[PDB]
């Protein structure tokens with residue numbers, strides 16, 4: 001019954017999507033197009049999570065430094081403010097993560113993306129846009145696995161840096177559950193891709209990772225990603 005209900009949540013907003021859930025070493029898929037789970041998409045802003053891990057691990061940034069807004073118009077007004085890396089994570093402020101990517105540099109970025117085995121691990125030659133328009137791609141299954149490992153601090157990085165990136169991703173504590181999440185919207189690719197990748201830590205300690213992936217269309221508000229995710233997690237008894 002739960003799976004049917006989640007399928008219809010996607011039908012109700014008139015697009016196709018999948019929600020991958022990971023608990024322990026096994027995954028389940030829900031939604032109205034389950035085949036999306038094993039299909040590659042650009043990560044868009046969801047790459048910020050790995051960008052931050054690499055930057056912190058290799059001492060290219062700190063968690064307390066402030067990226068000051070220089071007063072120049074940004075793509076979105078939400079980005080026109082002083083930000084730490086964590087603030088920029090929450091706002092998905094691309095210019096901050098492009099700055100970070102340039103600090104890391106192509107050689108180190110390529111080595112680390114390959115070491116961690118992220119998606120197709122192909123970053124090409126352009127260090128500041130490879131996660132937006134290709135060539136880097138990743139499946140929702142892979143995003144859920146990545147989130148699960150970050151949640152358990154089992155990515156191949158220091159525990160300190162994984163703890164720091166977790167803190168950047170914290171959304172809220174709701175009914176005792178701690179919710180961590182990163183959204184993404186690849187709007188200038190066709191078709192458009194929407195992401196919400198994260199995890200829940202339940203009061204008893206259990207970790208449940210998720211990755212929502214759907215086709216974004218004109219007339220579908222971006223708030224659908226969080227709404228469908230939370231409702232689905234509630235249906236599953238995860239929230």
Ligand SMILES: *C(=O)[C@@H]([C@@H]1NC(C(=O)O)=C(S[C@@H]2CN[C@H](CNS(N)(=O)=O)C2)[C@@H]1C)[C@@H](C)O
Pocket residue numbers: 043044045046076078091092094132183184185186187222
């Ligand atoms: C990353 O994918 C991309 C980000 N991602 C998102 C997103 O919604 O996931 C946006 S949308 C942009 C940022 N937040 C603004 C909405 N205001 S609100 N509701 O207060 O959050 C608009 C943007 C495309 C990077 C690469 O640009």
